[PDB]
Design a protein around this nucleic acid. Structure first.
Lengths: 61, 126, 96, 338, 331, 91, 59, 123
RNA sequence: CCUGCGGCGUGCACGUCCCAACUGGGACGUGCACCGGCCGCAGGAACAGCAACGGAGCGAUGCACGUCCCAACUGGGACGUGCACCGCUCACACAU
């Protein structure tokens, strides 16, 4: 949407409207992904995120 | 360059079509566009059609990944091949539009039966 | 929410600041927070409109007035003083 | 001792003042981070990230129907179109919802001016002149005064005439009204396109943010795989919401008395946190670390060090369920007859 | 050292304690007792069964008792844990130690691609049903992770690594995988790679090595081979939460006395109510396997009471002199 | 023998001479449970239960005068109402 | 037999079904030699593996 | 080859060993093939040369047979591979070991092979 | 006196269609959320005791060697040696 952000060296979000970073990386969308209560793809989401190691459980802390 | 466009992409953006595969994929999309019932563009329509065959090309420059991070596993379950491309802008352009597309499904017709089949093989070995 | 009783005596409410569209902005030097839709008047007790927004700090703040067709916001200069009906001026304690 | 790294309310366990070390610990209750799944869920909260379209009430109802919990509520309310932080308590931290409604709030707002301005410094100074106790009206009615502690112009673009600024403000302050007032002050008018709460109290962007999909996936993992680490990542113990309070650790026999309404009398105090003042909200906790209740210190910390009998604190909200510990009150030396 | 590594990282209740002339570190026990309080991480050959290899180890070693902590099918090689004598008191504690296999499988029909087999393996995760291969009481065991370490299409034969809960029937999992890849498959080979906290790289010796160590001991009094073959039973409890108990409290623990706070020299952060912990002395010897009735905060906040009861006493009685009843009160 | 019947699940896929099925109903069927049909006609028995503990697959070794092809996807298989276990039993 | 293994840089058992590893060297079977209680050749193995520096005590 | 595969024959000696095996196959009484068979023949004390294969893993399966050969003074050596021995036997099946006995038909050949073996030495 | 509990037609998501983005609309049926004081009930009236009298340790078909029949680090056959498949007691312990 209008609002986007990029991560600085300390992991803090820095917000901006631009679609490119000060360094060059694309800017992530600030708005979290839309949710629907009747989501039937939990198993598939966990499969993919465990395949790519993105699931919460694999990070420290 | 196709190398930095792929580098920009997400961690879930695999298997990534190489340069020649990407030229072929764009050609396939452009041909398929000429038939109304042979491309399903957009998240909603692609998801509906998959739930209800072909090749589903995803865009590796999406964020947050949760919007379609599950659909790769859906394609794996349904045995529909898939591959990521460096940008949604290119997919949108191949669809004859400026607006980008997150993903696109390309069905199969006699008119380009050969074309489709080639890319399919090249993405089955990837 | 009375809508009658033509205005009684009035007291200084502030001085003219700047303008934003038809809405007219005035800096208030008095302390009382005026009502909402409270009509504002000149020294001649001729209503010019009504309160629209109240914004600014607790003590010194600004007031926006929306006018009846009987005036344009550009018709007022710098230093022009506005007046308010004393009854519609509430004290700061009501919001402190 | 090295208690600096201990979890939740046990942090700096060794820095607290020690009234006494003599009592008989009972095995009742568990550390908050190691409760069974049921007690962990029933005594926790979720720093959920609100989807843009639905409301905060909708988010709370969805989390209820997902975790299958009887009661749940949110500290601060967000508008239907506003994303950001949203602390949703689970069936026992709901008692801290009232104490969490006054928590501060940091937002990020995108605004658009009606027409062009002189330069970016114009918007910067306009924002600098709206920092204080500002008047604000409810959107679509009484006027209210809300404080905007700080504000910064994160970015501004001129072609589209749109800016992004981050605001720290106290609860109830409608940042939409702040954007409108900034527009009226610059000299042209303005409005708000989007809003994003980056902090709801002491829960920031990096502080255990989770999404609705994360909640659903943790629930699925626990229900089908019988896996709990995901649900423990999503939900966190309510003690997190109380990491800023000054603590009052009590003996195990006094816990159930406090859960029964008994004030926090001095005899049942093991350790207390320095800096407690009269009428100051404090948290009554066990040595394990479970927050027994929230009380209001009727005595300073110096009087606590220099007193033997009396009422140290007055209950305000009991969180711990009754009978979770035995009724070990009334068996003391000075308990034969009132 | 072992069981004393990072001892300074444990919460210290008191450095004032009474050293005694009794006891020896687990890894320097005299040969007779060393075998009595040890275990072997053996590579099970394919012909003998777990019971047979345990009995052969007993016969070779000439020791009173021997037991194991997990039944390897007759034809399944891998790591087998064999406690010797006193160490057999720890067999029950290892009944639920998570295990890890490298199973070779065969499919009666070819698969479309390796990705098919990888996906079928991936979907056999979490808690799945399992039935003893040909009692008929179905159980449920959890596969934490799985991977297709190799596949070969000409032979239809693959090698997949699995991490599963203790008591999981790998052959059953392989039948499940075959039945899950649409073609049918059976486990033509198995190998336990990691039982509990023990695997290949952790001093896993072979049966010929046990026989050679026994021969060397008998014929040249060379116990070094036998030492490299038998590791202290304290190694089975390096992952356990340690409570160090003073010298004067060890014997009381040996006689069934509960562990009480006035004799806890150190307690490891992370202890919880109803937690399986190791009551160890100051020299690393596992006094007992205990259940903690006080959390670490409770131990830090109290000056007396019952810290941790005893679930299974490991150390023998009379190992330390009777030194209870001479406390500060002396009443 | 079966006075009535209940739906154990629907067809999954086939593996050699077998009927692997998707079992929607939570309850675990009994090993060697005769999986009946709508009209009270048995079609096989259970051989191996595999899958997770809430939505799993039942393996049936089709035995008598029927085949693994006589059933087509989208068909439910039936079970005796009194041949099940509660899911807490194996937990 | 079917299961063989090689070693990566870290020495972890990389388990494969291939007789020649990717690096080109021959593979090593993951199984131990068949054991027999009536085995008099302990001396023989001890002396050979002390000669060639393969005995466990040497490691 | 396994580190224990010594004494090791050179290329020319390997060819001459293959020749000795092939000629000795004429009198299978003088040949002894297989691991169990060579084991029991060595135990009974059968004189000859022993040709092992360095491509054996795990080495425990045969690591002792070199020691007994040294004990009884039955000279031996390793070939480059077991498949070479299998080809020498022409049975299209590898044989890790072979025992060669002395017959007049190849007396000079088995005399040259043994002399070269003694020249090879033992570490 | 303290505590606990309860009462005082708009949008959102999905589903099926029409058109003209991770989008923005409509129509047709679905569920989901919103638009301090008083009253009643319940428990308890709480100055927070308990530095040991039930704990602990004991007993209750396959495989290997050797000899032969023939037919890989082997899989078969015959017959031998073997190997595996409620009572007692101790203190009754807060650790100098």
């Amino acid at each position: 949407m209008y609002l986007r952000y990029y991560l600085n060296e300390n992991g803090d979000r820095q917000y901006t409207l631009a679609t490119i970073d000060p360094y060059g990386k694309p800017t992530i969308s600030a708005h979290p992904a839309r949710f629907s209560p009747e989501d039937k793809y939990s198993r598939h989401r966990i499969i993919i995120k465990k395949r790519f190691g993105l699931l919460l459980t694999q990070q420290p802390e | 360059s196709y190398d930095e466009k792929v580098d920009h992409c997400s961690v879930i953006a695999k298997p990534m079509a190489p340069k020649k595969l990407s030229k072929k994929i764009y050609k396939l999309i452009k041909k398929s566009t000429s038939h109304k019932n042979y491309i399903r563009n957009g998240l909603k329509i692609v998801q509906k059609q998959l739930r209800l065959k072909g090749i589903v090309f995803f865009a590796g420059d999406i964020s947050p990944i949760e919007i379609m991070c599950h659909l790769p596993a859906v394609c794996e379950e349904k045995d529909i091949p898939y591959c990521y491309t460096p940008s949604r802008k290119d997919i949108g352009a191949a669809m004859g539009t400026m607006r980008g597309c997150v993903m696109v499904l390309v069905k199969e017709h006699d008119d380009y039966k050969d074309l489709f089949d080639e890319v399919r093989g090249e993405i089955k070995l990837l | 929410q009375q809508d009658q009783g033509p205005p009684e005596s009035v007291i200084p409410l502030g001085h003219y600041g700047w303008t934003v569209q038809d809405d007219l902005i005035c800096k208030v030097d008095i302390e009382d927070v005026p009502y909402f839709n409270a009509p504002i008047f000149l020294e001649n007790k001729e209503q010019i409109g009504k309160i629209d927004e109240i914004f600014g700090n607790l003590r010194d703040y600004f007031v926006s007035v929306k006018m009846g067709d009987n005036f344009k916001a550009n018709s007022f200069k710098d230093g022009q003083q506005f007046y308010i009906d004393p009854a519609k001026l509430l004290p700061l304690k009501r919001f402190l | 001792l090295d208690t600096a790294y201990w979890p939740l309310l046990l942090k700096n366990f060794d820095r607290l003042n020690v009234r006494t070390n003599h009592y008989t610990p009972l095995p009742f209750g568990h550390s908050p981070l190691k409760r069974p799944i049921a007690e962990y869920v029933k005594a926790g909260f979720i720093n959920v990230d609100k989807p843009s379209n639905p409301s905060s009430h909708e988010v709370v109802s969805w989390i209820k129907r997902i975790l299958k919990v009887e009661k749940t509520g949110h500290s601060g309310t967000l508008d239907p179109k506003v994303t950001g932080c949203l602390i949703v308590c689970i069936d026992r931290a709901t008692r801290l919802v009232k104490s969490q409604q006054n928590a501060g709030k940091e937002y990020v707002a995108v605004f658009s001016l009606h027409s062009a301005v002189e330069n970016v410094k114009k918007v910067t100074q306009g924002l600098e002149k709206l920092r204080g106790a500002l008047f604000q009206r409810p959107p679509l009615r009484q006027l209210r005064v809300r404080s905007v502690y700080d504000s910064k112009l994160l970015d501004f673009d001129k072609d589209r005439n749109i800016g992004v600024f981050w605001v720290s403000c106290e609860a109830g302050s409608y940042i939409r009204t702040m954007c409108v007032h900034l527009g009226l002050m610059l000299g042209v008018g303005g409005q708000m396109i989007e809003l994003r709460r980056v902090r709801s109290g002491i829960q920031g962007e990096k502080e255990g943010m989770v999404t609705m999909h994360d909640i659903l996936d943790a629930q699925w993992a626990y229900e089908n795989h019988k896996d709990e680490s995901y649900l423990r990542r999503v939900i966190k113990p309510l003690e997190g919401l109380l990491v800023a309070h000054k603590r009052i650790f009590i003996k195990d026999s006094a816990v159930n008395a406090v859960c029964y309404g008994a004030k926090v009398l001095l005899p049942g105090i093991l350790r207390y946190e320095d800096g407690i003042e009269i009428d100051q909200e404090i948290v009554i906790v066990t040595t394990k670390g479970e927050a027994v209740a929230l009380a209001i210190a009727l005595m300073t910390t110096s009087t606590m060090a220099s007193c033997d009998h009396g009422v140290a604190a007055k209950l305000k909200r009991v969180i711990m369920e009754r009978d979770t510990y035995p009724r070990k009150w009334g068996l003391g030396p000075k308990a034969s007859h009132k």
